[PDB]
Amino acid sequence: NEKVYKKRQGKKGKYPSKYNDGLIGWAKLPIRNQTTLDKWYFDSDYRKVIGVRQNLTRKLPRSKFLLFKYDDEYGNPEGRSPLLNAYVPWKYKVQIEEFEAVGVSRDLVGMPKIGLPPDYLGEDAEPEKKAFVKYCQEVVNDLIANDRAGLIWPRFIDPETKEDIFEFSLVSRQGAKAYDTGSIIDRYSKQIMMAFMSDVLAMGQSKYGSFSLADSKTSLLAMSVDILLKQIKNVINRDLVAQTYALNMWDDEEHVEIVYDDIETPDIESIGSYVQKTVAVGAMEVDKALSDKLREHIGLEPADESKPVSENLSP
Amino acid sequence: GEVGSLGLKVRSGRIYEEPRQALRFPESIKTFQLMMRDPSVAASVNIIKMFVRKVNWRFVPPKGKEKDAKMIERANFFNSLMNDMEHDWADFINSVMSFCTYGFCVNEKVYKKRQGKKGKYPSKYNDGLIGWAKLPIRNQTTLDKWYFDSDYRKVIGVRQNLTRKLPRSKFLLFKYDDEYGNPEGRSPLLNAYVPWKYKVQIEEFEAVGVSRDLVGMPKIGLPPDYLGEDAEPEKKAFVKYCQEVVNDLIANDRAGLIWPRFIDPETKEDIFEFSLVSRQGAKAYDTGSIIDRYSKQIMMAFMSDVLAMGQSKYGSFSLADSKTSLLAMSVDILLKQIKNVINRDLVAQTYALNMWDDEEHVEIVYDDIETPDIESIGSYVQKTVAVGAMEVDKALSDKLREHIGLEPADESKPVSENLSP
Amino acid sequence: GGINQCDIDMRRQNPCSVKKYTEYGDAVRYYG
Amino acid sequence: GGINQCDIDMRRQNPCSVKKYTEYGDAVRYYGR
């Protein structure tokens, strides 16, 4: 995400703004595509070289863009996508599924089969035989299992070989499929969901977990999301915030960080129980902080003492 | 500054982002109509739409400064102007909900002028102020080309091919899952193609299979002499009767048969038989469990398992509740996305064109899909105010009363005490 | 059996024939 | 059977047939039958 700065300059510029202070800012990209970066430029001993092109040239410098790596362990710019540790079950599942679909497609058990003597099939065959073959073709292409379904077939047990010559029957298989594909595919799907730790997708919301980070019952996937959010926060802090803080001048030691709230509010009843059972005995001291935290847990903002609730409109 | 660019495919103006030919603008429009036919897909993208049409919208001052009189009067102008449009706000949302089926929904804004009966696009109010009317509207099958801008960076303009090529700032575009900043975004139907294609064909094989299950069908075997035109009238009469027997045989009370039987001394086999055709095998794959797997996978893609499982006692659709369902939160992301498009789009256009040029703007908000669980809320406050923590406020006494469905109480008239015993 | 509609209609003209409860096609016909 | 996409169309034109409720390759075409 290449940072593209901006100056208000009283609007009237390439990147218009709305606050007239003539201060530096950001606009446009970010953005950028992963499939464009061709080569990553190193730096001598390979230590701390976060620079790549975007294929005169369009090479970008190290400090102009932000890099968000998933599981950076060896300092590889590409990091490690979660799909990597789910490649194999995916391939197995897709293969088996395609084999299953093909097998269902070619399940020719029960199809009508008509046995005619060879002399019937041909071009020099008598016109009646050609009509016979044509009617057999119509039967094959049109016969269904409606209520007047039936058949009047010619038949003749030849004196020799003691077998009929005209043979109408349904093709039959004398075996069963070795492996049960459905269970295999379900197992591989379960493994895939295990790889991303997204069991809640199939199993459903369990009473032993929740999506609240601040809760004591945070789910594993929620914890992974927390790790991702912390990574994003740290990258943002060391990157663009620092660049804006320095370049725009000011040059203050202490920087301002970005923070994020919770995905879902914790169990309200549990918080209430905790507060009730710990404050009526003492322990936790009531202050403005609790009074705003609980009230924003409800969904409000710190109470305005300027307008308290009436006494008349009450008991 | 802009050392890079968002070059996705740049083939011929048309976005060739998706490597699958079927799922591209000329054909993706064709495919999405097909995929909407299946009830599993259709219900999945219909529950999401229902949620959006259910919530309400109200214009409010920003996060702070809710006390300012100038801001509060501006909201009253916007709220009244929202309903002034010839198509109700809800109707606009319904047109927006083409969102899910295609991934984007252009809406060319049309601005009515000086409020005042007059004409062109008539409207109530006569404060000679600018306003909105008519389209929105728009359909996804009309947009042919998206005009670029030099280096392909930040080019939000497209035509409507007779042709009605529109500029960048004339319309609102909504992106579902904008990833590489492509105009079309990504429809939720995109990650449900594979299950759907598998589900539909295997269903279709099942229906054909039932129709072509000829086990038990009556088969009559006659000597070749009987079958023909030169056969003796007696033989031809026999064949005719067999035709009616085939055509009219049922399993009624008087069902039965009196057939000729002659075991040929040669070959030791009978010549005439009436027999029911029999199969000597079983179908390999169980189609029933196969379809069920894909149906769950389709619902998993849209995270609409509530359609199958049903409403649970630990899941809820209320956004403000602490147990929001996965699907319910998805509409929130969609709901927030529209609010984000509001940034550059109509309100800013309405604000800027009408002049003013104020730093703080007016933003639109949404309410909750369903009211949060009162019993938890009730247990919370009643058992935490007697200890302290909560400071009772007008906001508290208003939200709690609004949860039931009431409005902020007027202190002018209180409830009586003479009856209260 | 039922592989020819013209045959189907011709056989429906016969008055001395049993009347079945449900027949093929009686699910998408406006007038039964 | 039905393999040649060709023979099928020729056999799809013969008036004297039965209107099948569903056949192969039906749900992937918009203009159904």
Numbering used by the authors:
A (entry chain A): 123 to 177, 195 to 454
B (entry chain B): 17 to 177, 195 to 454
C (entry chain D): 101 to 132
D (entry chain C): 101 to 133
Please quote the paper that reports this structure.
One set of whiskers points “up” toward the capsid, while the other set points “down” towards the tail. Each set of whiskers is made of four protein chains: two of gp30 and two of gp31, though one chain of gp30 threads through both up and down whiskers. The connecting copy of gp30 may be involved in maintaining the up/down conformation, though how this would occur is unclear. Each whisker is attached to the neck by adapter protein gp37, which binds to a gp30 dimer. This is then bound to a dimer of gp31, completing the whisker. A key component of the neck is the dodecameric portal complex. The Sf14 portal is structurally most similar to that of HK97 and Agrobacterium phage Milano.
Bacteriophage Sf14 infects the human pathogen Shigella flexneri. Here, we report multiple high-resolution structures of the full Sf14 particle, including symmetric and asymmetric reconstructions of the virion capsid, empty capsid, portal region, tail, and baseplate. Overall, phage Sf14 appears to share some similarities to other model phages, but in different combinations: both λ- and T4-like decoration proteins, HK97-like capsid and portal proteins, T4/Mu-like tail fibers, a Mu-like baseplate, and a P2-like tail needle.
